[PDB]
């Protein structure tokens, strides 16, 4: 999972 897609 990518940190920049954590909502």
């Amino acid at each position, epitope marked *: *999972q*990518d*940190g*920049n897609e*954590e*909502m």
Partner: antibody
Amino acid sequence: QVQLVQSGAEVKKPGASVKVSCKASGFNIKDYYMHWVRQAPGQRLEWMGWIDLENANTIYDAKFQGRVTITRDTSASTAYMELSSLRSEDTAVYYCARDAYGRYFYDVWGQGTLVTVSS
Amino acid sequence: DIVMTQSPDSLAVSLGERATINCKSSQSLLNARTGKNYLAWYQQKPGQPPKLLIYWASTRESGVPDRFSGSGSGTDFTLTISSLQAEDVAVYYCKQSYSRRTFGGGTKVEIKR
């Protein structure tokens, strides 16, 4: 007791394929991603890809795209990395490691699997 | 791909002294809506997988001694070992998890004598 146990060392000729296993125990793998990371002798860690352990969705690094396949067997609680068309440069220790949404860190690693590629 | 650069490549510190390891990313690792910098530090000894020390730039992992601390934001990060012990001789890696995954080159820490 969380642990990731990988299969044993491998020796392969150039052109061959290798499949390394990563047995997970002590947590619900469905909440996690399993990543594969390698390390050539004396070099830095290099990420290869990940698989979503629930739905088996994969993301590979472009450097291995077309040569690598990451799969997971839910009933065996195990993930696998298969690397094909092996060449000398693939000589490395291969690691599995878990991660998950909201973490973005590798808290648990397998012990490593040495793959030597040589004539 | 995000490029991670560590400095120095190797460090020699006397027992009880301070070790400082720098890590630079080619782009910001900060997610503005979570406030997190997705930077992590790992310690690796021979024959072993890396061990997580610090994640989210400054959050220490369970069981890691409090002499290890991380700081920085955006593109510049630092790992400080405040009083080096013999057990701390290892290679340290920074690693970004903002977009895919990239490790730095590693910094080898030795005891100066």
